[PDB]
């Protein structure tokens, strides 16, 4: 039966997020860079 979300339904959803983030002025999260400050602190946390 395929995905149940229906194209018309989807635009309504996706549009809300798009306005919210822009309203809120939200910069997107980047990809973790090869040289990154906190790589150590976030490995130790994660492995422990």
């Amino acid at each position: 039966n395929g995905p149940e979300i229906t194209p018309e339904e989807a635009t309504t959803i996706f549009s809300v997020m798009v306005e919210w983030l822009e309203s809120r002025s939200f910069s997107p999260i980047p990809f973790p860079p090869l040289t990154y400050k906190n790589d150590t602190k976030i490995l130790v946390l994660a492995l422990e």
Partner: protein
Amino acid sequence: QILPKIVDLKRILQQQEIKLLPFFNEIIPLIKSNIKLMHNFLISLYSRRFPELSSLIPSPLQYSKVISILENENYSKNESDELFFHLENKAKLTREQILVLTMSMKTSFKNKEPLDIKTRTQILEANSILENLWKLQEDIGQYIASKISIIAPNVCFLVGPEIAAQLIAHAGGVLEFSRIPSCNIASIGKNKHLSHELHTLESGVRQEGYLFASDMIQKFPVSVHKQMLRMLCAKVSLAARVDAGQKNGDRNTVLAHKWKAELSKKARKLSEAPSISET
């Protein structure tokens, strides 16, 4: 120049509807090269307008069609479900392909400005060229599909003539296809691959081609699919190598008989499963 050269060749084939096939070999590389131009030329035009469509719709024919539909003034009034209906009906898409378009439609492109007249003309001229090329290519395959028993008696015997015709139309000749090493074959009829494709089959077949749709695969349980592409893809190339070798006046099957017998018997054994064990 295209329309002039295109009209005759379709009729030049339809007028006949052997000597042509060697010309056919020359042609197949040529049409394909040009389409990858015009397709990549259309992208040049929408880099400004709607940058993501290059990714989300991979093939030229469905990209060229959505160029138009989306460009059309009439739908653009807005709150038209006509767009959706149209895509589904006109430029063949599946629900999954539309959902992406809808949302991607929100983030990127600007409908404040409707693309300029010059560029519109270019698109129209480009779209017409694309359509002409695509029709030509489609026509070629049918003619090939008619000659399959003649040019490739073994390959139709395994794969089926609907498909064999599709294969041989890709490298543009038996010779060319025999040159192809068997690992590269299975990936011929693959629509393309993009990140959000979201695929892992139960089969475990990472690549699904024209061969994947064939008889000698889908007549078997789903567990033995990834073992039967590989096992069949080799024997296609063996069959195709024989076809080039074979003299044009006389073509004899017989190789296929062994290569089906093995394949059907071999596929059974994979399915059969272990004998039960004494405890």
